[PDB]
Structures are given as structure tokens and as C-alpha cells.
């Protein structure tokens, strides 16, 4: 029985969900318009 | 002696030079400007 993964105050699965220990990396990609007047 | 290739009236090397029998193919390549106002 894998009842170890629950959201109970006293469990280590609730500790990972309240505070995520692993960082999240987000890379913002943009688009640069080269011919702006020609689109008009 | 390869005196056969001369420009004498009576030779077949002068016939190739007066009138070139082999066609010449020329392909004209152009450049099209995509962002003309942005160069200005
Ligand atoms: C979790 O830990 C104890 C358990 O009773 C409690 O005192 C504490 O307030 C709880 N935390 C939250 C956010 O409920
Ligand atoms: C070549 O051929 C004869 C050779 O005498 C002559 O009548 C003719 O005029 C010559 N052609 C030219 C362009 O000189």
C-alpha cells in the first residue's frame, strides 16, 4: 500500500507540495520584426 | 606541326571564329529587396 504519498500534515509528500524544493527554469523567447513598415 | 588552327580564309579555324556555332547560355540573377524602407 503506497499511502505514504498523501497531503497529510505529518507526511513528506505534503512537504514537497507546500514548498516545491526543485527550481523551475523558464526561458522567454521573443520575435523581432525586421520589416515593420513593409507589413503595413 | 599544328598550323591547321589559323585565321586564314580557307581554314576551318577561321570558320569557327567568324561564326561561333555553339550557343551561349546566360542566366540573369537578380536581388529583390525585402525591407526597403528599413534600409532608409
Ligand atoms: C501543521 O503542523 C501542526 C500539526 O498539528 C499544526 O500545528 C500546524 O498549524 C499545521 N500547519 C498548517 C498550515 O495547518
Ligand atoms: C574569303 O573568301 C574568298 C577568298 O579569296 C574571298 O573572295 C572572300 O571575300 C573572303 N571573305 C572575306 C570576308 O574577306
Curated annotation (Swiss-Prot), chains A, B:
Signal sequence, start to end: none
Membership in a protein family: Belongs to the CD36 family.
Name of the protein in question: Lysosome membrane protein 2
Disorder: Epilepsy, progressive myoclonic 4, with or without renal failure: A form of progressive myoclonic epilepsy, a clinically and genetically heterogeneous group of disorders defined by the combination of action and reflex myoclonus, other types of epileptic seizures, and progressive neurodegeneration and neurocognitive impairment. EPM4 is an autosomal recessive form associated with renal failure in some cases. Cognitive function is preserved. Genetic variants in SCARB2 can act as modifier of the phenotypic expression and severity of Gaucher disease.
Top-level taxon: Eukaryota
Oligomeric form and interacting partners: Interacts with GBA1. (Microbial infection) Interacts with enterovirus 71 capsid proteins VP1 and VP2.
Glycosylation sites: 9, 32
Subcellular location, record wording: Lysosome membrane
Function: Acts as a lysosomal receptor for glucosylceramidase (GBA1) targeting.
Amino acid at each position: 500500500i503506497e499511502k505514504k504519498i498523501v497531503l497529510r500534515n505529518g507526511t513528506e509528500a505534503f512537504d514537497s507540495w507546500e514548498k516545491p524544493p526543485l527550481p523551475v527554469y523558464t526561458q522567454f523567447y521573443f520575435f523581432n520584426v525586421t520589416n515593420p513598415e513593409e507589413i503595413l
